[PDB]
Symmetry: D3
Subunit: 266 residues, 6 copies
């Protein structure tokens, strides 16, 4: 695994955005061979979406031949609701770039048949072949997507019951009232994520320090699903300073030595 030890959220966003751009440009996507990008919501990717939109407007990237898939979506939350993941993605990213509406893939949290909806999302990924880069964040409790504690490490897209801890954390977006946070969500599985060619996790704040420790220095287990990355051949964690506080000095020293040139570019 690669861990990029940066200082601030602004730097994290800039490194991630730049990595996404270079992968796409190096890929040279065509209409017959698009680049498939998996994306997350939440507060963590804000600086990355910001940087991505800038680079696009500056003419550095084109999303014309990029197909996107999101990690999850709230169940039973009106699609028009500003806090639905559909609204989040359009407001913060889609409405600003040249990506065709047919290239966008989002789960329908209001689908009448939940099993069918999840299964079809898997079929859609399969029709493209693979997700080339899946970007995400991590929960306080260590979840990747919404694969809460005790989620199978070989899981597929399906519905999951959100942990009280996750709902309290997400209530910050629902006027700080947990009763307004949806109780369920459709989410890609750990197995789904393990199938992506590259996984890039963004980690910000001391609130994520225990999750980062579990991922990097902990053992593989289903309580902290972020530990599944130890089993992925190409995972990267991009971190700010506060989030690395629980790591051993030797561990952080190793990554600093490794990524010195790859980050110190002002």
């Amino acid at each position: 695994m690669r861990l990029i030890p940066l200082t601030t959220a602004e730097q994290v966003g800039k490194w991630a955005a730049r990595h996404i751009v270079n992968r796409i440009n190096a890929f040279k996507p065509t209409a017959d061979r698009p680049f498939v990008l998996g994306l997350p919501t939440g507060g963590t990717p804000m600086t990355t979406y910001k940087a991505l939109v800038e680079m696009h407007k500056a003419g550095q990237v084109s999303f014309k031949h990029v197909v996107t898939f999101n990690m999850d979506e709230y169940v039973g939350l009106p699609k028009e609701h500003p806090e639905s993941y559909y609204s989040f993605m359009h407001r913060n990213f889609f409405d600003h770039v040249d990506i065709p509406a047919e290239n966008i893939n989002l789960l329908n949290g209001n689908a009448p048949d939940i099993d069918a909806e999840c299964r079809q999302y898997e079929e859609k990924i399969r029709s493209y072949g693979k997700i080339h880069l899946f970007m995400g964040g991590v929960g306080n409790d260590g979840h990747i997507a919404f694969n809460e504690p005790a989620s199978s490490l070989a899981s597929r897209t399906r519905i999951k019951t959100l942990t009280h801890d996750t709902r309290v954390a997400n209530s910050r977006f629902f006027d700080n009232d947990v009763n307004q946070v949806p109780k369920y969500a459709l989410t890609v599985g750990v197995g789904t994520l393990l199938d992506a060619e590259e996984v890039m996790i963004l980690v910000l704040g001391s609130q994520k320090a225990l999750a980062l420790q579990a991922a990097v220095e902990g053992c593989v287990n289903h309580m902290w699903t972020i530990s599944c990355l130890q089993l992925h051949p190409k995972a990267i964690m991009v971190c700010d300073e506060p989030s690395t506080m629980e790591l051993k000095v030797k561990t952080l020293r190793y990554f600093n030595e490794l990524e010195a040139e790859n980050i110190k570019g002002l």
Copy 2:
């Protein structure tokens, strides 16, 4: 993983039996497409075999098109011995249901060529395709089938030397004399079990509390092979009250919330 927190062994048996019945009936097995059931011995499945036989006699299930495979068998123990797994299964299940003798698969602990016997058991599973539901229990030391501490997590059917701890526990069936308990057994591997479509483990008593903790809150490791379930896409653990004593309050709370409707049916 799913964990069903029940109170007594009677409830555990009833939930498990009911789950087996609904899977079979939903499957609609034919002579050209049978339902393959993996089964265990020991004290744990007693209430489940009892409930299964009842439901059969009440006309709720038919084992006519069900093929069964057992987890293991003692090596060097006469097949006629009442404590052999062959005798256990006939006395407690086979002799009471409408399953054809040709649909029953048991390992021969007295086979002259042990490697050949184990290999052929694997071939037989393969000829059917897959085990749809493999039911089992857990050892005090955390073993699944007889995959004792330090058993490969990718293991196949083979012979294994029983741990002194396992023999002392099993001596309860041999007049409380460990010297009468067989030292070896042929057992399906962890990889064999991981290949089943669904795995259902029954957990009863405080004697199993540490094993349950390891499975649910511990990391993946070969010392407590029951932890392999964290890697299975469809595992369920059915527990009574005493067995959950080593779990964290938050963990048990999560499962109770999840399975409330799925268990509270009187």
Copy 3:
């Protein structure tokens, strides 16, 4: 996993050599079906190379139809340098046995295109099909080959930055001057090793006691990559006495009972 608890390095070498000979002879390699052997360097395999050369000269083994692959090699170290792994292997093994030069495979640490070199080494393994037996050792920090702490458990052959701890340990071969130890090395991946049919690790000295504990009694994790063996269907660890000091009494007792006949042959 199998653990062979021996007393001295001389016994370890003799058991390992004998195991390699019996595998080859049982295989009956031909020019159209060679035996593929993966090999390590370092101080650990010294007694095994010694015993192998003896058995060859005594007419017990022939390496005529054996193809070999080494685990790694230093990057930027002149091939002629006595401490390069190319020199180590020729001096200690190749120059003494009847193995054809075309059957030898070593990584080129001075290759102009590192990615290409690593990729081609993988292709070469693939053209043979599989490595039948991969022999190795373990690092103080728990590494297998040079898959240092935080290496993916599904990794392939690639370049890796050596840990300060590994360089200090290896400086014993460079006049005890860490500044002379290369900083990088091309190494087979954990996934590469997991693909071998059988893996045999040699463990010598109390300096390796924590690594052995992690492998046998620890959980699967990428910090101690030797733990990947818990996931291999056919792994063996051959140990001397000092290296088992960190194991539990019950664990060592189990293996002693198991391997009693398999080792007590004077």
Copy 4:
């Protein structure tokens, strides 16, 4: 120790307030033999202070012969600043009860000789003999008073540097401006607390879940100073529901049956 498992912060303050009043009335303090009460600040004791005030108003307790000592005080913060502990205590407690000004002992965070201040505080306690009851809270990092991680378990009153985490936690009272929270604070030591006849710690909120687990199920260490309570002859922890989430099922079960009739008072 005794752990009182309650549901709400309202029940916690009421249970703690009733306990203090019961101790005081049983002691029957007088001018020559006052009851010595140790007290804390922060958000946790609010409901306790309100309840004590209601009880004093109803005529149930008098503080005429109660001498108090506070745990700590910020260094360099002006005395009349609303966030100084001096201000907090008068506003939330002293202003509403009949306690004589001479009976109130607070640390002078702005004294010329900080070292003389600490020595004199310890002297003051000794002049009275012993603190009969010391009430306190617990930090997210497990500190008792401001004895931050790595504080001697035999420490006395002295100056202490606040951990970055505590300042972030306390910033709530400084307009979430960490820069405004004082970096230093005079505090009573762990030995000072262990010298008290009885220690009662109030635990509220999920954020204290790990600190509660460290105090109850962890080992004694100087990283989580709250663990010192395992060494005290008479320690009580009064908790609400969310703070108990990281404890084992059997732990909370034990305490629930012990305190059943002891908390039924509503």
Copy 5:
């Protein structure tokens, strides 16, 4: 501490009995200066009591000037009930030796003022000065005496509520009827034990393997009160083979070489 690694419970009782007799004879007790012996009940000390009796019969020891204090006694159980500790001690020890009735101190589990009973017991010990040797056993959950998990490490003699596990364990003596085992018991505290000049704990059986590991290799904590022995100046643990199974190899090796000539007596 000293750990005496023996094989059998017969050797354990003989080693412990010889130790007591040696201490007593060396002390040379008299009416004005008696030897004070602290004693336990339960299944563990049986072989010790038998051996002590054989030694007294052979003329090797006299209890004429030995004062005894027992660790605990069940609350509410009638005195002449065969399972009361009073009954156990007379039947298994007092009835066969020359100890004066006035030298025997037992806890009155059926006293009117339970609190007065405990205070007076502590007073009795103080009147003699100090207990010279306190013998005890260890519970499966690590309790010393009946100082159940979460008992203060500075505790004194008091009333205590038995853990569900201890009652299950003790049900062996109550026809395996847990409902018959007393729920409460008066017991000496951890501080009471730490005040003794020397403490000797007998450990027998695999069931105590984890308690032994907690006492020897664990950290001091109030969950496994047996860990208090790390703080005692003169603590001895006498063990049989199965109780040592959870210790590390190097731990048991150290103790074996230290006590070699000290246990060769047969």
Copy 6:
């Protein structure tokens, strides 16, 4: 405790030497009130002893009124043997300073009554009252003095059997011949050390990284006796860079900001 994070062993000896001189000068010892210094041997204090010598030479300190006590001494090793602690201390320290022979207290490793020797040493310390400063090092296994793992935390000066690991470590001074290193040694106990007014431990090298982690972030236990420092009112650990590699990032950060201006002296 205080942890002084320095880079080099040269800075460590200089910081420790300046600390001793400052304590001595502030104390202003005299014939009737000498300063009592506890001292160690081994490789760690070399730079400290050199620095103290340079300071005495420059006229900064006098040892005319300093009484010293050493931690331990090998049993059975001839006094004038260059590796005896008596020889080490005179050669490395006493020969170069103005300390009177009568002020020097060393353990007599070759005394007729070893037990009388230990009792008299403790008596000697008591006659002076208290050791004001005890300097020591830490073993790889965490021992303080020669209080090997499983040593009472309340122990006094006594004879002790060296662990195999310590003898291997100390063989460096005996031509790497473990057989030449004395198996026994008289040593001060943990209680003896805890009775000192201040304890300063010097930590140098990666080999002590785990011992440092056990002392700072671990729990108090008798396996790593260095952990006793968590219980001491005034303990200081002076470390070089490599010994800090196993600590968490936040731990070392806390200490760095606390001691910033306290180590800038060069």
